[PDB]
């Protein structure tokens, strides 16, 4: 139960569907499955062909250049889980160069544990934007999809209605489906670990993705970790053993597995049937247990291995001694560094040389954890034990606090390393102790670390003068030991509301230093009031072919400007909702020019117009229109409105409104905005 | 007459005006004159001090850090000509770091034949824009003027009226003078070579600059070429011999000159008293004649010489054999190449290596005329007989039609040569015969020749469609041996009123070549009618570390619209 079929370890199928019937009954394939290179197949060769029995694949799965096939909903309706122990350039699902493959129907796929999915050169495939990979994968940014039918936008990959979840991702709701029929199932935000059932209840704590009954280890569909006899289990109880991270086997099983290479003979450690023991361990004639002892040499093929992915990496997983040379070349675009670290150099020695060529995203080398010694018994051509070229993101090699390095023979080869400055280079020379080896042009002294000023020399500001429209800085004028080499001063400035982070200045006359009255400076005019700015300065000096005087840069500093008179208080609306109440409302001004303290409010009693007092309204023409000195005032604080009381019925009022960004000394305030209003008659 | 004083050859004066009275009477100083490093001088130390006796200096003249002096019209009112045989970084007049020096008054200076003038760090000097150098010099674009009182625009350097010629040069009439009194004299457009007299009449065909009477060899002021006894002469009549390009001397004079190094012992050849003979020649015990014979090793100091100017060059003038190594380093800014050719390697051999470092304006090496062999017996470190770095204008080395090259040992070193494409580099490897020596990265395969598409491959347009609003070009689709490497098509377009000489296109599908219907095109909309356009295409491909497939460029074509 939970798995009615068998194991049937992975065999890959070619050229016709004849050997496909060898892999019918089995429920979970150990290893991987590849289906490839069937040019003489037909669409009718798949309609009489289905395998619902497969549920989980351990390692990976591949589809490559088979004609006549258009879907996968029939061939594998019920594949659900990919564990991904053995990966494939950090992928586990290969959908590639498949002519006529237009859809998947892979709705039952729920979680892919480790790896990613690459889809390429499949000019019929659609229904792809309807696939939320985050429900199935963790690192969705490692999924390359290109050269497909969706890339020429034609497919209406729709479903009739509600069912399929239309979830917002980037711009709007994305309807999630697999076919026009099959929606993409979404478990709720609490059943995410072990999957959910049909109504959405959480499964048992050892289920995964699907369960036949909610909260039942005997009625799951897929185990999260381990399987044992109708129960998904958290661990192997004694005397059982974890085999390939998915099940518990007895002693006799992994015992008799050893007896068949007479190829991967097996041993036991940590209640686990494993291939081999690491260093300091020994087999056992009784039970094949990795016993500790006194004193693991992974001798390469031809002493050499190009290393480019996890597929390369797991071949040297757990090794301690490398009897060969290593080549690091990853044309990448994605940091694999943690997974790179996870199966790498728990070693000290490399018998031959080390090569690092044209890798892109490798920012560091700290994943070499215990790496100490370079023997270099076989050197790189040009007499090198070390190589380095074309590493666009490499900045740090190691912290030389506790990391060490011993290099027996060979030399260093540093070229085209634009984020690798010479400081840690010479530190590596020092800690290597091999400084008396390197000739000229063993280090490219024009390309290595030429994107940021690095090394040592720091500028220090002597004086700061600020204004609302002026900036002056004063700092110590540094001079290199040849004072003629100073060409000028590179200055970078910008504004910065955060703190999470261009002009040039001629050098002055040096001419002495009892009183070198040459403290250099620059005036900025382009200032905004109340505004935070971020400024730093670099020294422009002449390059020399020798050990050049490294030149200085300044600290990034933050200076807010002062504050001027605020702008016009926008839209004064003066409504009189009562006979003595006038609401005046307004918008903030366009330029507050500082933190606004308050709003200066003036209301002025405008008398009636004086020409009306000497007119004869008893004559026809009686058309009446239904309409320093201290004025009454208000400092409206933290409000964009003000109702005014104690007002006359039938009296027009002038209103002068200003804002004020300064209140306590000598009020800096806005310019006058005007309106006029009239109270209601009683 | 014409020169009543004497020669008094060049000695340079330091630390006080005491030794200056050694050089009083003399008419034309052979060699050079430098006056330097006098801090404790006063302006009163010059009003009782004048030398009108000097008219011409042969080689050069230098003024360096002497205080209290403000002018020069008193010390040398009548210096007139600088010939300029021995130069000083292609200058013959050095005015440098002179505190209080505010004007010149050097009105009698008329022609400077060879060399230039450099002015620097003289924060008192003015009257500078009033000096037409074209009247006095030829290559006026080799004159360096900076760090002066003129550089902070204050001096009104005017004259009271007419006198001084106000000549349009660049923007308007430029008044030409030396002081507020001394105008700059301009001879007419017919008396230009030999100079003019006061009223403007032409001087004699052997005069130069000034003449006491117009058209009189016996009443010149300065000779054009040669002097003999009150007459400026075109050459030496017998039995006389040319000495230092300015006079005629007898056999007795240059004879007795030889008898004094017992340092420049002299011989005679081609009716000339000269220092030495070139290769294949022999002296004479009777008359010191460069007689031809069968079979000039300019053995250097420590086998090494940095070469930077003509002053470095004339030390190796006319050499044939170099027992040493040469360093070519000219942070220049001006092409010296003709005069560089004028006194250089009529040679075939170099015993040591050759170095070329950071030279800027050297577009070619054709001034190397006869060079064939490098022995390389002392190498550049790193086992090189040859060196090349940082040459921002170097494109051609030589024409390998007739130029040859023989290399014994050593290697090649090519870096940062941004207009030096690899084709002629491999041709140099071939004609050298030392192709089986160069390792990896002896040639910078990224920086050498990366400013213009060079190598081989030419695009050819199959079809042309024009309009007044549409342009379509179709060409033969080139495909490299890895068709994946083609990433796009770089196109450069612009209009062209003369013929004296930007968009991208994606690559189409290769997929076959019985019928590769992939003749690629671009439609242009931005057309003006009746307008001539200049269009050409480059192929954008993938770099590889190996011998990369060089990529194609098209021809600059001209298309006139409707």
């Amino acid at each position: 139960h939970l798995y009615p079929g068998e194991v049937c370890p992975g065999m890959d199928i070619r050229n016709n569907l004849t050997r496909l019937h060898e892999l019918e009954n089995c429920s979970v394939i150990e290893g991987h499955l590849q289906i490839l290179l069937m040019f003489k197949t037909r669409p009718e060769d798949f309609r009489d062909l289905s395998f619902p029995k497969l549920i989980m694949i351990t390692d990976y799965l591949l589809l490559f250049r088979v004609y006549g096939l258009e879907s996968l909903k029939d061939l594998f309706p019920n594949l659900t889980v990919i564990r991904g122990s053995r990966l494939f350039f950090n992928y586990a699902l290969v959908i590639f160069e498949m002519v006529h493959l237009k859809e998947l129907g892979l709705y039952n796929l729920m979680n892919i544990t480790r790896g990613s999915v690459r889809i390429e050169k499949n000019n019929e495939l659609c229904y792809l934007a309807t696939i939320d990979w985050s429900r199935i994968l963790d690192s969705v940014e490692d999924n390359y999809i290109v050269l497909n039918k969706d890339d020429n936008e034609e497919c209406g990959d729709i479903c009739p209605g509600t069912n399929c979840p239309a979830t917002v991702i980037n711009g709007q709701f994305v309807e999630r489906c697999w076919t026009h029929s099959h929606c993409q199932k979404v478990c709720p935000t609490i059943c995410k670990s072990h999957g959910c059932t049909a109504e959405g209840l959480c499964c048992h704590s050892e289920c995964l993705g699907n369960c036949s009954q909610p909260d039942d280890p005997t009625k799951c569909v897929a185990c999260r970790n381990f399987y044992l006899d109708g129960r998904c289990v958290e661990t192997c109880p004694p005397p059982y053993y974890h085999f390939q991270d998915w099940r518990c086997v007895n002693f006799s099983f992994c015992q008799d597995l050893h007896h068949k290479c007479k190829c991967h003979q097996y041993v036991i450690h940590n209640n686990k049937c494993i291939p081999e023991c690491p260093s300091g361990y020994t087999m056992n004639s009784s039970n094949l247990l990795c016993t500790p002892c006194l004193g693991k040499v992974c001798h390469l093929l031809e002493g050499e291995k190009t290393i480019d992915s996890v597929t390369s990496a797991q071949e040297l997983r757990g090794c301690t001694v490398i009897n060969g040379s290593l080549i690091i070349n990853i044309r990448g675009g994605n940091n694999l560094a943690a997974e790179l670290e996870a199966n790498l150099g728990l070693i000290e020695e490399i018998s031959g040389y080390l090569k690092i060529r044209r890798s892109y995203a490798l920012v560091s080398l700290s994943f070499f954890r215990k790496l100490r010694l370079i023997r270099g018994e076989t050197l790189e051509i040009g007499n090198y034990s070390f190589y380095a070229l074309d590493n666009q993101n490499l900045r740090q090699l190691w912290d030389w606090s506790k990391h060490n390095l011993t290099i027996t023979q060979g030399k260093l080869f540093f070229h085209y390393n634009p984020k690798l400055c010479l400081s840690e280079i010479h530190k590596m020379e020092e800690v290597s102790g091999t400084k008396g080896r390197q000739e000229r042009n063993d280090i490219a002294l024009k390309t290595n670390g030429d994107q940021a000023s690095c090394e040592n020399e720091l500028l220090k500001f002597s004086y700061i003068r600020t204004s609302f429209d002026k900036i002056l800085l004063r700092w110590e004028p540094y001079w290199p030991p040849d004072f003629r080499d100073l060409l000028g001063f590179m200055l970078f400035y910008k504004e910065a509301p955060y703190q999470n982070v261009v002009v040039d200045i001629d050098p002055p006359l040096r001419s002495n230093d009892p009183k070198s009255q040459n403290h250099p400076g620059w005036l900025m005019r382009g200032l905004k009031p109340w505004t935070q700015y971020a400024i730093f300065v670099k020294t422009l000096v002449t390059f020399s072919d020798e050990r050049r005087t490294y030149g200085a840069k300044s600290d990034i500093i933050y200076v807010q400007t002062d504050a001027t008179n605020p702008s016009v208080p926008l839209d004064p609306i003066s409504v009189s909702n009562s006979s003595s109440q006038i609401i005046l409302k307004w918008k903030p001004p366009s330029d507050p020019n500082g933190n606004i303290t308050h709003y200066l409010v003036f209301w002025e009693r405008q008398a009636e117009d004086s020409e009306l007092f000497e007119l004869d309204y008893c004559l026809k023409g009686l058309k009446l229109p239904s309409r320093e000195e201290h004025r009454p005032f208000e400092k409206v604080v933290n409000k964009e409105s003000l109702v005014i009381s104690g007002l006359r019925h039938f009296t027009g009022y002038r209103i002068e409104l200003q804002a004020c960004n300064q209140d306590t000394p000598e009020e800096r305030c806005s310019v006058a905005a005007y309106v006029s209003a009239r109270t209601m008659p009683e | 007459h014409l020169y009543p004083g004497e020669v008094c050859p060049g000695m340079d004066i330091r630390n006080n005006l005491t030794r200056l009275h050694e050089l009083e009477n003399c008419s034309v100083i052979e060699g050079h004159l430098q006056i330097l490093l006098m801090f404790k001088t006063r302006p009163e130390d010059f009003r009782d001090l004048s030398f009108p006796k000097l008219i011409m200096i042969t080689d050069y003249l230098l003024l360096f850090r002497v205080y209290g002096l403000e002018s020069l019209k008193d010390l040398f009112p009548n210096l007139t000509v600088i010939r300029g045989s021995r130069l000083f970084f292609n200058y013959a007049l050095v005015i440098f770091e002179m505190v209080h020096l505010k004007e010149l008054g050097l009105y009698n200076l008329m022609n400077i034949t060879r060399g230039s003038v450099r002015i620097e760090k003289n924060n008192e000097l003015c009257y500078l824009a009033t000096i037409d150098w074209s009247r006095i010099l030829d290559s006026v674009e080799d004159n360096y003027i900076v760090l002066n009182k003129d550089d902070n625009e204050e001096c009104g350097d005017i004259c009271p009226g007419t006198n001084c010629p106000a000549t349009v040069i660049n923007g308007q009439f430029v008044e030409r003078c030396w002081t507020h009194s001394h105008c700059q004299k301009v001879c007419p457009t017919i008396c230009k070579s030999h100079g003019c007299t006061a009223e403007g009449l032409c001087c004699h065909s052997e005069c130069l600059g000034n003449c006491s009477q117009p058209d009189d060899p016996t009443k010149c002021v300065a000779c054009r070429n040669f002097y003999l006894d009150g007459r400026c002469v075109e050459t030496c009549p017998p039995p006389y011999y040319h000495f230092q390009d300015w006079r005629c001397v007898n056999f007795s004079f240059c004879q007795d000159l030889h008898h004094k190094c017992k340092c420049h012992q002299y011989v005679i050849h081609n009716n000339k008293c000269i220092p030495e003979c070139p290769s294949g020649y022999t002296m004479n015990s009777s008359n010191l004649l460069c007689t031809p014979c069968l079979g000039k090793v300019c053995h250097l100091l420590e086998g090494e010489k940095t070469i930077d100017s003509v002053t470095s060059a004339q030390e190796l003038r006319g050499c044939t054999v170099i027992n040493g190594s040469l360093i070519i380093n000219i942070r220049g800014g001006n092409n010296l190449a003709a005069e560089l050719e004028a006194n250089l390697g009529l040679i075939e051999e170099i015993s040591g290596y050759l170095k070329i470092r950071r030279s800027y304006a050297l577009v070619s090496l054709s001034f190397f005329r006869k060079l064939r062999l490098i022995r390389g017996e002392t190498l550049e470190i790193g086992n090189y007989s040859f060196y090349a770095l940082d040459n921002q204008n170097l494109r051609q080395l030589w024409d390998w039609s007739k130029h040859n090259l023989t290399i014994t040992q050593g290697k090649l070193f090519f870096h940062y040569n941004p207009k030096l494409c690899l084709s002629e580099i491999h041709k140099m490897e071939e004609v050298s015969g030392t192709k089986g020596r160069q390792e990896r990265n002896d040639i910078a395969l990224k920086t050498n020749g990366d400013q213009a598409s060079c190598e081989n491959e030419l695009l050819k347009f199959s079809y042309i469609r024009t309009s007044f609003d549409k342009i379509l070009l179709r060409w033969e689709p080139y495909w490299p041996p890895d068709f994946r490497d083609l990433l796009g098509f770089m196109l450069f377009y612009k209009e062209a009123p003369y013929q004296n000489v930007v968009v991208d296109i994606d690559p189409p599908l290769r997929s076959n070549d019985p019928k590769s219907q992939n003749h690629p095109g671009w439609l242009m909309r931005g057309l003006k009618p009746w307008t001539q356009y200049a269009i050409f295409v480059k192929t954008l491909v993938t770099f590889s570390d190996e011998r990369r497939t060089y990529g194609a460029k098209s021809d600059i074509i001209y298309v006139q619209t409707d």
Binding site: - | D482, F483, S511
Partner: peptide, 30 residues
Amino acid sequence: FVNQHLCGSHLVEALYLVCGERGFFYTPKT
């Protein structure tokens, strides 16, 4: 027979033209 450096689908179709029938098995060990 082309005499040219080959990659991609060009090389794929070339290999299929060479093979025709079976051409390639997949038994490294079994």
